Amino acid sequence: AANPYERGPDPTESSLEASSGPFSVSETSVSRLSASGFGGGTIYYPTTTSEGTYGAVAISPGYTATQSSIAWLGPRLASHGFVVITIDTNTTLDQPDSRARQLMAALNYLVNRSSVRSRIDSSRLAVMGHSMGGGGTLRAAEDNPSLKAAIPLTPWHTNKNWSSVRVPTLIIGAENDTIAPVSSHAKPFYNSLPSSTPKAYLELNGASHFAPNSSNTTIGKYSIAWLKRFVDNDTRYSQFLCPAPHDDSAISEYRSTCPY
């Protein structure tokens, strides 16, 4: 009752690892011609409106890719209480800085022109992307500090310095990525992020560059947790992002000199 942005019941690990959240998901689409500043998209959104409006998320594909490579994120995130647009880019060969402009154009369409705008709270927006759309997710985050959250997935970018980003960022890289190797992309990106901005780095064990293109329980769970925590201020989701022993109902307080 205190936080006016909480949606859905108390999270558990099970509900975040499941293939669907608690909300039924409808979808619509904007054509490429209609879409001003990006190559069209599909919009996934919670069918129900009775609990209040929702935050919105734009998601961008990578180099030479279309929405079908990020398609599974749409229903996965939308079912936890989010309006999601998986876009195509103006061309499949757009460099990451282009994709950042298109990520913002997409959120612009969603807020102002789309048929589900009344369902969005336009002050609570987030960006996500894969590969060069992850680099575009970083650039868009630096240039629009009013974003609530950003999630680069196996990101790629020639720029390695992201110290001006004041938006909470969760970087998901892949341990065996041979296309955007974490040692020269995802890990440098995270180290350069400031310590005053909440941030996180999650490396997928054994994963390749194409882990984000298929349904993935880990990417799913931690993205939902990250967006809920920062697009909704939902502190019910801190137990997954900052796990502690006092999360157990039997333990009121725990402190340690961890890590040991």
Where does this chain bind Na ion (CB under 5 A)? 32, 35, 246
Kindly tell me which of 90 and 223 has the beta carbon lying closer to Na ion.
90
Active site (annotated) includes residue 195: no
**Which candidate, 138, 145, 161, 147, places its Cα nearest to that of 108?**
147
Which of 88, 177, 232, 234 does the annotation list as catalytic?
A: 177
Kindly tell me which of 29 and 208 has the beta carbon lying closer to Na ion.
29
State how far the Cα of 114 lies from the Cα of 48, in Å rounded to an integer: 17
Kindly tell me which of 87 and 170 has the beta carbon lying closer to Na ion.
87
CB 9 within 8 A of CB 22: yes
Buried b (16+ CB within 10 A) or exposed e, 107-126: bbbbbeebebeebbbeebbb
Kindly tell me which of 29 and 53 has the beta carbon lying closer to Na ion.
29
Which of 130, 209, 223, 232 does the annotation list as catalytic?
A: 209
Residue nearest to Na ion (CB): 35
CB 203 within 8 A of CB 173: yes
Min CB(168)–Na ion separation in Å: 24
Active site (annotated) includes residue 157: no
Which of 60, 131, 157, 185 does the annotation list as catalytic?
A: 131
Active site (annotated) includes residue 209: yes
Q: Enumerate the active-site residues.
A: 131, 177, 209
